[PDB]
Design a protein around this ligand. Structure first.
Ligand SMILES: CCCCCCCCCC(=O)OC[C@H]1O[C@@](CO)(O[C@H]2O[C@@H](OC)[C@@H](O)[C@H](O)[C@@H]2O)[C@@H](O)[C@@H]1O
Ligand SMILES: O=C(O)CCC(=O)C(=O)O
Ligand SMILES: [Cl-]
Ligand SMILES: [Cl-]
Ligand SMILES: [Fe+2]
Length: 304
């Protein structure tokens, strides 16, 4: 395909667990798009999740209602590269906005395989006979992302061994988890402390090996959710907020929300009644995954 990963890019992705950044839009197109989208998103009247019983879940799955986001998750610049990794049939199962307002704590070091981390119940399940896990995250910079405003950071090559156990639980306590200093950096996990999920209580992330991923508005980075990743704090030197938009992809054989019609996490609870995965690549998905083809405003999931 036109935007497939090169053989060299594919080898680097296999080694590092991330690849990019790549361009989806020019910075100028992204700036104007985000200006409009940010306003539009304040209107939740068509959102898949009406009652939030509150929560970070408010940031979830706005592609299910929003015209632009519906196109974005299907961009060939993104999908051709995800296809290079995940094969001929792929679903977008989750999107999430990640704001860092001026002064916000950095995101905790974490890895996620099943996405039971917060809820205690797996959200994606790969074939049990195999050794694969996690989801391909595409994180798009809707604003510029630099160290001072809380860009992502990665510890390269850590995607093949989990340091966290998502069957352990972590307590939701926003009150307590506000800019807690961890190894000299203010960090948290949206009201949780991801250190609670460590397999070994005394183990620490190899933060000395962390690398920054600075990006311009309109770029995206592709990484395994099983990769050690985090963000710097937003120092507030800039009075502009940072916004990332994560779209999460799995091959269509992965079980999405097995045995669930609701999820409860991040201080909220939502019904999956209007949820579906979106088939962004290919046209075969097993019956056990509920799909949607259009947004709640009847916009088809296709790149425009
Ligand atoms: C027709 C084409 C179909 C293609 C389907 C997509 C298959 C993706 C396979 C993969 O690379 O999975 C890698 C994920 O599994 C992980 C989980 O730790 O790796 C495991 O897979 C192996 O890759 C062969 C090993 O290298 C690692 O030890 C690892 O445990 C991480 O690299 C990722 O989260
Ligand atoms: O943007 C952030 O601070 C965290 C992003 C993240 O953890 C993810 O995309 O999985
Ligand atoms: Cl590490
Ligand atoms: Cl994650
Ligand atoms: Fe993450």
């Amino acid at each position: 395909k036109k935007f497939a990963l090169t053989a060299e890019q594919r080898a680097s992705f296999e080694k590092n667990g991330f690849i990019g950044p790549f361009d989806a839009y020019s910075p100028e197109e992204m700036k104007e798009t985000w200006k409009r989208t940010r306003l539009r998103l304040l209107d939740r009247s068509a959102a898949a999740y009406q009652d939030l019983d509150a929560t970070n879940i408010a940031n979830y799955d706005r592609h299910l209602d929003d015209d632009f986001l519906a196109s974005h998750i299907c961009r060939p610049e993104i999908c051709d590269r995800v296809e290079s990794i995940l094969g001929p049939n792929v679903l977008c199962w989750r999107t999430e906005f990640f704001p860092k307002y001026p002064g916000d704590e950095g995101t905790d070091w974490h890895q996620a395989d099943t996405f039971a981390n917060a809820s205690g119940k797996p959200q994606i399940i790969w074939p049990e006979n195999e050794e694969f896990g996690g989801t391909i995250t595409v994180w798009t910079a809707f604003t510029d992302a630099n160290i001072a405003n809380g860009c992502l950071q990665f510890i390269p090559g850590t995607q093949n061994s989990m340091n966290y156990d998502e069957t352990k639980r972590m307590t939701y306590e926003p009150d307590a988890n506000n800019s807690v200093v961890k190894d000299g950096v203010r960090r948290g996990f949206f009201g949780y402390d991801y250190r609670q999920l460590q397999i070994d209580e005394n183990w620490k992330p190899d933060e000395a090996s962390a690398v920054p991923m600075q990006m311009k508005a309109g770029q995206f980075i592709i990484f395994w959710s099983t990769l050690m990743h985090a963000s710097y704090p937003h120092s507030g030197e800039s009075q502009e907020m940072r916004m990332g938009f994560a779209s999460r992809y799995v091959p269509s054989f992965v079980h999405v929300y097995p045995d669930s019609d609701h999820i409860e996490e991040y201080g909220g609870r939502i019904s999956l009644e209007k949820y579906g995965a979106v088939q962004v690549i290919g046209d075969e998905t097993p019956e056990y995954n509920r799909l949607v083809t259009h947004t709640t405003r009847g916009k088809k999931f296709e790149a425009v």
